[PDB]
């Protein structure tokens, strides 16, 4: 029932009940509503939320390593292929030996 | 309730109560809200600042190392592609020999 029940809620209780004993809440005890305007976010929270930001990037990244990694073997692979083409080139070499 | 219920009316409200009972808190009991000047950050507050600060940077820099590891390993393979280039010229080296 909280999501009902916030803080507007809380101070109209809370003064209601004050009102019954202790009356003039509004300017001593409890600051007015009006006013009670919400806190700024703390340093601690800040540097936690942008270093918790990084903490899942970097496996955003680790991810992406991955890929650029088997990207790599495959091309490996091809260059692998293309310089068994140089070797049968040397085919033709030995053939222009037996020639002369 | 907290964010209305601050430093000023908790003050407010205690020497009230201290008013009821024992009055000239002013002076020997509660210090005065107008000189309860907000106090200065410990070196173990900063220090620990600094550090978690650090911390997270550290959390950049892998992230990024890993950009620059990925373009070295395209321009190795790219730099293959060349020497492989180099190796279409032997043709040419064994054809002037077979010229000759």
Chains 1, 2 share one sequence.
Do not use: C, W
């Not at 703390?42 to 680790?62: D, F, R």
């Amino acid at each position: 029932l909280a999501p009902l029940f916030g803080l507007e809620q809380d101070r109209y209780m809370t003064a209601q009940i004050f009102e019954l004993m202790g009356i003039k809440d509004t300017h001593k005890y409890l600051l007015p509503l009006e006013q009670y305007q919400p806190p700024e976010p703390s340093p601690m929270e800040i540097l936690q939320l942008e270093m918790t930001k990084a903490q899942v990037e970097n496996v955003q990244a680790s991810s992406q390593k991955m890929i650029a990694d088997a990207f790599d073997q495959r091309e490996r692979t091809t260059f692998e292929q293309q310089k068994a083409a140089d070797e049968l080139s040397l085919r033709q070499e030995e053939l222009q030996f037996k020639q002369e």
